[PDB]
Design a protein around this ligand. Structure first.
Ligand SMILES: *[C@@H]1O[C@H](CO)[C@@H](O)[C@H](O)[C@H]1NC(C)=O
Length: 219
């Protein structure tokens, strides 16, 4: 009291993305510090990578509480399918997905340009994560996103990242040759994040407003 946040089997990635095995951590109160195991099992259910992961762990050492803000409600994506799930993130024998993320896919045999924006009027700096899906092959690319030749652009006043998916056969991990590469940014108060993609975007539905700052950290 104030108690630590013990992640148990969950990694910081699993917690923030909302790996379904980490559902116990969907809403957490203020903590004194964060306790993570040396090699947590529950991280990226759909396999992949997380850019600047150590730097995110260092930022979390100075955060003592988050408030999840619904920055991009799933219903806003009216021209895309948002129900996308995988057996890699299965819940009760059914395909599912990261709780805080949205897999945008083709709807009615079309993937029109996906655009979304959020103005940080939350009252504090906000951590936002998004992903890029790197399929296993061109057949997978066309099935999910209609065509080969796509991009994912994310921008703020301090960020300009415009990614191209890498289509490549890979050894199966968690039943998948595809990979999802996640990145993060800190959106300043009153700044706007803009998302634009012609395919392969794993959009956040939530952002994490930094509600309490303080020293102690991550064990
Ligand atoms: C974001 O919201 C703040 C509200 O205080 C406003 O000052 C600013 O104009 C907004 N950004 C845009 C792009 O409208």
């Amino acid at each position: 009291g104030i108690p630590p946040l013990e992640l148990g089997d969950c990694s910081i990635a699993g917690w923030l993305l909302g790996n379904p095995e980490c559902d116990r951590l969907l809403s957490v109160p203020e903590w004194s510090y964060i306790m993570e195991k040396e090699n947590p099992r529950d991280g990226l259910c759909y396999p992949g990578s997380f850019n600047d992961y150590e730097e995110l762990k260092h930022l979390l050492s100075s955060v003592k509480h988050f408030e999840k803000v619904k920055i991009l409600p799933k219903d806003r994506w009216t021209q895309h399918t948002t129900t996308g799930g995988s057996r890699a993130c299965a819940v009760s024998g059914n395909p599912s997905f990261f709780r805080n993320m949205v897999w945008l896919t083709e709807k009615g045999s079309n993937y029109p340009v996906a655009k979304g924006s959020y103005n940080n009027t939350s009252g504090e700096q906000m951590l936002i994560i998004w992903g890029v899906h790197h399929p296993n092959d061109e057949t997978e690319q066309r099935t999910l996103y209609q065509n080969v030749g796509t991009y994912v652009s994310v921008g703020t006043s301090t960020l300009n990242k415009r990614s191209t998916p890498e289509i490549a056969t890979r050894p199966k991990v968690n039943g998948q040759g595809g990979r999802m590469e996640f990145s993060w940014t800190l959106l300043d108060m009153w700044d706007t994040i803009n998302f634009e993609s012609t395919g392969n975007l794993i959009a956040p539905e939530y952002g994490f407003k930094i509600s309490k700052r303080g020293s102690s950290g991550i064990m």
